[PDB]
Design a protein around this ligand. Structure first.
Ligand SMILES: C[N+](C)(C)CCO
Ligand SMILES: C[N+](C)(C)CCO
Ligand SMILES: C[N+](C)(C)CCO
Ligand SMILES: C[N+](C)(C)CCO
Ligand SMILES: C[N+](C)(C)CCO
Ligand SMILES: C[N+](C)(C)CCO
Ligand SMILES: C[N+](C)(C)CCO
Ligand SMILES: C[N+](C)(C)CCO
Length: 431
């Protein structure tokens, strides 16, 4: 009867065109903003309000704005939510200054996931703080308190840091954070815990590298001698240990018989390789080397072998210990690729590496891996025949390999501290 749309323009009750003003259209039951040129706004903002395609003011709804690359939420009056929480579709969301939805980030004691929702009853590893946090049922981080999560007990310190490798009263939180319910061997002692977690007893032990009756032996955490008086202490080092300031100190003070040096991984040289080889050669310290593989197939394996050979000659390496193909359940950082799961593919990968190295004149070449992989994915006679260095950070290795006989190593720890090295060190007993 009265006001009406004329293309981009709006003719009001008085017969004049709208200009620089909001109008409410009863037919559409929506608000529209008319600009100074008399045309309605659309697919754009006006102050605190967003005008959708066709001009309709957004209200009680999400809008994704591709210019800002952000979600926004327009409230009951159309105004964007900002510096405030909103319960939407039965989930809590936080809006920052200027209305940008919070995502993958903290808001005080709450954490918003990648879709903006406040998380509840979830673990969060936050690399920004380098620790685990647990967001409770109410969304707040567990703090100075116990929480039972998935059948196990965890303790959270001040500021919510998950306790690990440490005591909280009568309870010990293990490396996973889980409360000990069994036994823990540490500090040269065995700690015995009730099923409910409380410490019951501590029994002194004399395990590890021990000098007894004029000779040196290695005892596992079951107090069993591993090897003979000639058992050797071998560390393995990489750029991850940083630059070693004084190698001679490391060797003498820790009684280290030899070193396995990381070459790098498929396609990349280790940052400390050059320095490590230089020093180990200069001091006549016995060493071997290892390459962490990201191989998927035989081509990758032959390339791994070529890289290995290239580095050996480049640095004039004098190899007292073997060349090691370090085989693990690898996965790219960006998760774009992961190791082949089938045994037969690894049989081909491993044997191509071996054959290539052998053809190049290197006969002292073996596989390193961890016990569980060797019991599963790598359990094949043509793989196991090459395996003589095995990782298991356990009380005993208790693993048999009928396919290899001779000198071998057990990497029993990745958490040893040694004089002259910053941080934790991998150590093996060679027997
Ligand atoms: C709602 N407008 C009339 C402004 C345009 C869509 O027909
Ligand atoms: C306040 N506006 C007129 C801009 C619309 C919502 O009420
Ligand atoms: C919603 N923003 C504040 C990001 C733009 C509109 O003024
Ligand atoms: C629209 N969001 C993705 C921001 C939340 C609702 O799924
Ligand atoms: C609105 N808060 C997120 C702050 C509390 C609701 O869990
Ligand atoms: C969990 N912290 C308290 C450490 C940071 C976020 O508030
Ligand atoms: C804290 N979690 C149990 C989730 C991780 C242990 O590594
Ligand atoms: C991206 N990564 C370094 C994990 C893969 C190496 O090929």
């Amino acid at each position: 009867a009265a006001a009406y749309w004329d293309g981009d323009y709006y003719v009001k009750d008085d017969g004049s065109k709208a200009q620089s003003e909001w109008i409410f259209d009863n037919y559409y039951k929506a608000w529209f903003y008319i600009n100074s040129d008399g045309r309605y706004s659309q697919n754009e903002w006006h102050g605190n309000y967003y005008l959708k395609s066709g001009g309709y003011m957004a209200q009680n709804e999400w809008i994704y704005d591709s210019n800002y690359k952000s979600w926004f939420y327009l409230k009951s009056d159309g105004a964007y939510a900002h510096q405030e929480w909103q319960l939407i579709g039965n989930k809590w969301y936080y809006f920052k200054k200027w209305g940008y939805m919070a995502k993958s980030q903290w808001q005080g004691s709450y954490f918003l996931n990648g879709q903006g929702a406040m998380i509840q009853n979830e673990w969060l590893y936050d690399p920004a703080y380098s620790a685990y946090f647990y967001l409770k049922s109410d969304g707040t981080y567990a703090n100075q308190e116990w929480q039972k999560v998935g059948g196990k007990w965890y303790y959270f310190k001040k500021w919510g840091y998950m306790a690990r490798n440490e005591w909280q009263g009568n309870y010990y939180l293990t490396g996973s954070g889980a409360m000990a319910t069994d036994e823990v061997i540490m500090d040269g002692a065995r700690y015995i815990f009730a099923a409910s977690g409380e410490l019951k007893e501590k029994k002194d032990l004399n395990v590890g590298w021990v000098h007894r009756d004029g000779k040196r032996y290695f005892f596992n955490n079951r107090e069993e001698q591993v090897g003979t008086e000639h058992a050797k202490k071998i560390i393995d080092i990489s750029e991850h240990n940083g630059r070693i300031n004084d190698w001679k100190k490391v060797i003498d003070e820790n009684e280290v018989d030899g070193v396995i040096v990381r070459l790098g991984y498929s396609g990349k040289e280790d940052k400390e390789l050059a320095h490590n080889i230089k020093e180990l050669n200069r001091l006549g310290i016995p060493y071997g080397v290892y390459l962490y593989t990201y191989a998927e197939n035989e081509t990758d394996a032959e390339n791994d072998a070529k890289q290995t050979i290239e580095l050996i000659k480049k640095y004039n390496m004098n190899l007292s210990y073997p060349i090691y193909y370090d085989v693990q359940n690898w996965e790219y950082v960006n998760k774009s690729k992961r190791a082949p799961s089938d045994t037969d593919t690894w049989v081909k990968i491993i044997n191509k590496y071996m054959d290539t190295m052998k053809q190049a004149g290197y006969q002292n070449v073996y596989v390193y891996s961890y016990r569980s992989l060797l019991q599963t994915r790598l359990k094949h006679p043509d793989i196991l025949k090459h395996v003589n260095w095995v990782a298991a950070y356990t009380n005993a290795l208790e693993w048999e390999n009928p396919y290899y006989s001779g000198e071998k190593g057990w990497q029993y720890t990745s958490s040893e501290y040694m004089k002259g090295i910053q941080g934790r060190v991998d150590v093996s007993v060679w027997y």
